[PDB]
Write an enzyme that holds these catalytic residues in place. Structure first.
Site, PDB file in Angstrom:
ATOM      1  N   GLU A 227      -5.371  -8.493  -0.398  1.00  0.00           N
ATOM      2  CA  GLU A 227      -6.362  -8.413   0.678  1.00  0.00           C
ATOM      3  C   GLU A 227      -7.679  -8.158   0.563  1.00  0.00           C
ATOM      4  O   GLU A 227      -7.709  -7.381  -0.548  1.00  0.00           O
ATOM      5  CB  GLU A 227      -5.643  -7.122   1.784  1.00  0.00           C
ATOM      6  CG  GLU A 227      -4.276  -7.266   2.138  1.00  0.00           C
ATOM      7  CD  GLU A 227      -3.865  -6.136   3.033  1.00  0.00           C
ATOM      8  OE1 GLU A 227      -4.746  -5.604   3.802  1.00  0.00           O
ATOM      9  OE2 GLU A 227      -2.504  -5.904   3.266  1.00  0.00           O
TER      10      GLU A 227
ATOM     11  N   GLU B 234       0.794  -1.063  -0.008  1.00  0.00           N
ATOM     12  CA  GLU B 234      -0.033  -0.048   0.047  1.00  0.00           C
ATOM     13  C   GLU B 234       0.786   1.257   0.032  1.00  0.00           C
ATOM     14  O   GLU B 234       0.753   2.059   0.747  1.00  0.00           O
ATOM     15  CB  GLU B 234      -1.003   0.050   1.059  1.00  0.00           C
ATOM     16  CG  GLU B 234      -1.715  -0.986   0.826  1.00  0.00           C
ATOM     17  CD  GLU B 234      -3.156  -1.017   2.094  1.00  0.00           C
ATOM     18  OE1 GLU B 234      -2.880  -0.261   3.111  1.00  0.00           O
ATOM     19  OE2 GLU B 234      -3.930  -1.964   2.062  1.00  0.00           O
TER      20      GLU B 234
END
Length: 313
Positions: free
Chosen positions: A253, A137
């Site tokens: 995810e 991220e």
């Protein structure tokens, strides 16, 4: 029946799970999760193909250049990778939660480069069922532009010792699906691109106290036509981009926090899993245990049918 190697390695990720809240804590265990060797046997027995392991390398390095990783910590990660490979899982190791990188990437990008030079050197001779993942991220001041500049430098150092190992490249801006178009690729045949999926965020993160403002609870997700189509539209956008850019996609995810009602969680998880399968995306549910967890550590049993929602069997 020549086939692209990266696409075949992406299929090996299959249906996976994140072994989170552990090595990406400041110290493993300090968030209440500590990786037991038995966890990997449990994961494999349940039928997952792979495990993704968040690691906060930046909490375990020397303060000065070239930022040597603490021996004890590298030994720990090597032990954990060894055990998961022993249990016939594909293993993805990343760098995760590098707070200074988010704030001052010009200063700390070079530190990530040095971390990866070391991790690549340490794992160079490991089987090809171990994959690297440069950073989790990218976001904040590590903008899509800075990331597009940084990750190839890291990849360059990885490739010196690991010429063909799969390296997973995250979508920037928290790896939100819509920012896929901001990612600039490089000419490397052994990369996979990854995004994370938590829409509707007010559903998957309702009641999560770490979000500011804390979001109201009682938000449902009912599997209505319009709700399913929102997800399909999102994943289609990523799929069209990936096909245009000749790269495979891992949904690294996905999950709904336990303050969401269980039936909603079960329906949302199943729908995300099915739509990722429909577009040929590999996937890793977030996460094994803790607030989004599939496995009840106390009872030593899987939460069902949530687990079946994430895995599909």
């Amino acid at each position: 029946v020549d086939k692209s190697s990266a696409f075949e390695y992406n299929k090996m990720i299959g249906h996976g799970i994140n072994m989170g809240n552990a090595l990406e804590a400041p110290v493993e265990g300090s968030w209440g999760v500590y990786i037991e060797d038995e966890y990997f046997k449990i994961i494999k027995e349940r039928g997952f193909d792979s495990v993704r392991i968040p690691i906060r390398w930046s909490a375990h390095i020397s303060e000065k250049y070239p930022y040597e990783i603490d021996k004890f910590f590298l030994d720990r990660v090597k032990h954990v990778v060894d055990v998961a490979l022993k249990n016939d899982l594909v293993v993805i190791i990343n760098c995760h939660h590098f707070e200074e990188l988010y704030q001052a990437p010009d200063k700390y990008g070079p530190v990530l480069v040095e971390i990866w030079k070391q991790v690549a050197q340490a794992f160079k001779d490991y089987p090809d069922k171990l994959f690297f993942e440069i950073f989790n991220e990218p976001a904040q001041n590590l903008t899509p532009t800075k990331w597009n500049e940084l990750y190839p430098k890291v990849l360059g150092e990885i490739r010196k010792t690991n010429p063909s190992r799969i390296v997973i490249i995250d979508v920037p801006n928290w790896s939100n699906y819509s920012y896929v178009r901001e990612l600039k690729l490089v000419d490397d045949k052994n990369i996979i691109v990854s995004f994370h999926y938590y829409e509707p965020f007010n559903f998957t993160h309702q009641g999560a106290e770490w979000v500011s403002p804390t979001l109201p609870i009682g938000v449902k997700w009912e599997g209505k036509d319009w709700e399913v189509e929102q997800i399909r539209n999102h994943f289609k956008y990523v799929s069209e981009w990936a096909k245009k850019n000749n790269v495979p996609i891992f949904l690294g995810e996905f999950g709904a926090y336990s303050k969401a009602d269980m039936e909603s969680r079960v329906k949302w998880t199943k729908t995300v899993r099915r739509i990722a399968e429909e577009f040929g995306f590999s996937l890793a549910y977030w996460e094994f245990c803790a607030g989004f967890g599939l496995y009840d550590r106390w009872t030593k049993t899987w939460i069902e049918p949530l687990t079946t929602s994430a895995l599909g069997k």
